[PDB]
Design a protein around this ligand. Structure first.
Ligand SMILES: *CCC(=O)Nc1cccc(Oc2nc(Nc3cnn(C)c3)nc3[nH]ccc23)c1
Length: 300
């Protein structure tokens, strides 16, 4: 019913194989077998790297209950936690991996309906995060995951932050940052807001519309703030109508409050997704096919 954090013992799940890793720790494909329940659930298990200053179990559980309460069709949900020598987060498994790799691998068969639907879904997920006062701070096609070709979910690997009721900004510290996805105010001042997430949403859409091209390819990250200040932006993808490109450009306004709100992006992309071939022009669009549960019915 309501999303609630489950506490798991080590007896109730198994890490099967590594899917990937990073500064955050390691993600495994796994199986969750809840005690007494006689069910087997495929999951992703994130075992977090040991910190110099590990949080107390009470601190971790408090954060986890908030994380588990994040319940939207387009955000990957925390299902449970196991606290031992390490922190293990049991997440929904997204069978098809990240959307960036998916669009690169399948670009010859991705049509306008899918692209625009994905844009709607990501906007809905981000709008939900904003309602929950969560700033994501790392939105990119690599951090949207694929449940089915028809259904994607935003994920978080540790950068997301909860704002207080009266806080409108998160002020970050030093470290590696995803420069080519970031708003200017984040690059120059380490300021993050829901409106800087909107900038990143625009870059994410650009990634999808170019079927996974690298933004500002070949350009040093150190030079990005300079080119942005000159007014340069990512170019119109060849498949995009002016209407689509203009929404993307609005996401990259210098004035954060001149950028669209996610609630507005939901409305605009929903309109476009209702008539996809009006808004994106893809050769052979009507012929393209991705795996669907209705294939057997239409002999595909
Ligand atoms: C393009 C970015 C990328 O490759 N991300 C990535 C790699 C490995 C693990 C991971 O985290 C999660 N992966 C899945 N599912 C998955 C299927 N095939 N692969 C390679 C990953 N589901 C998850 N649920 C929460 C976190 C992850 C991301």
């Amino acid at each position: 019913n309501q999303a609630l954090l489950r506490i798991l013992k080590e007896t109730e799940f198994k890490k099967i194989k590594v899917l990937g890793s990073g500064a955050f720790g390691t993600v495994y494909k796994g199986l969750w077998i809840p005690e007494g329940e006689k069910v087997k659930i495929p999951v992703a298990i994130k075992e977090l790297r040991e910190a110099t200053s590990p949080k107390a179990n009470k601190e971790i559980l408090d954060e986890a209950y908030v994380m588990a309460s994040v319940d939207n069709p387009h955000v990957c949900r925390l299902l449970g936690i196991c606290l031992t020598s390490t922190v293990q987060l049991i997440m929904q498994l997204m069978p098809f991996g990240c959307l960036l790799d998916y669009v690169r691998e399948h670009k010859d068969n991705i049509g306008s309906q899918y692209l625009l639907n994905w844009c709607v879904q990501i906007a809905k997920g981000m709008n939900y995060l904003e309602d929950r006062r969560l700033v994501h701070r790392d939105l990119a096609a690599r951090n949207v995951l694929v449940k089915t070709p028809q259904h994607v979910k935003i994920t978080d690997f540790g950068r997301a932050k909860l704002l207080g009721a009266e806080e409108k900004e998160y002020h970050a510290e030093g470290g590696k940052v995803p420069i080519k996805w970031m708003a200017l105010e984040s690059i120059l001042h380490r300021i993050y807001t829901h409106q800087s997430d909107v900038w990143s949403y625009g870059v994410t859409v650009w990634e999808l519309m170019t079927f996974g091209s690298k933004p500002y390819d070949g350009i040093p990250a150190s030079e990005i703030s300079s080119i942005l200040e000159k007014g340069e932006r990512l170019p119109q993808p060849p498949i995009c109508t002016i209407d689509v490109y203009m929404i993307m450009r609005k996401c990259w306004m210098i004035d954060a409050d001149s950028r669209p709100k996610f609630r507005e992006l939901i409305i605009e992309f929903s309109k476009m997704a209702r008539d996809p071939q009006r808004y994106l022009v893809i050769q052979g669009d009507e012929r393209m096919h991705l795996p669907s549960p209705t294939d057997s019915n239409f002999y595909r």
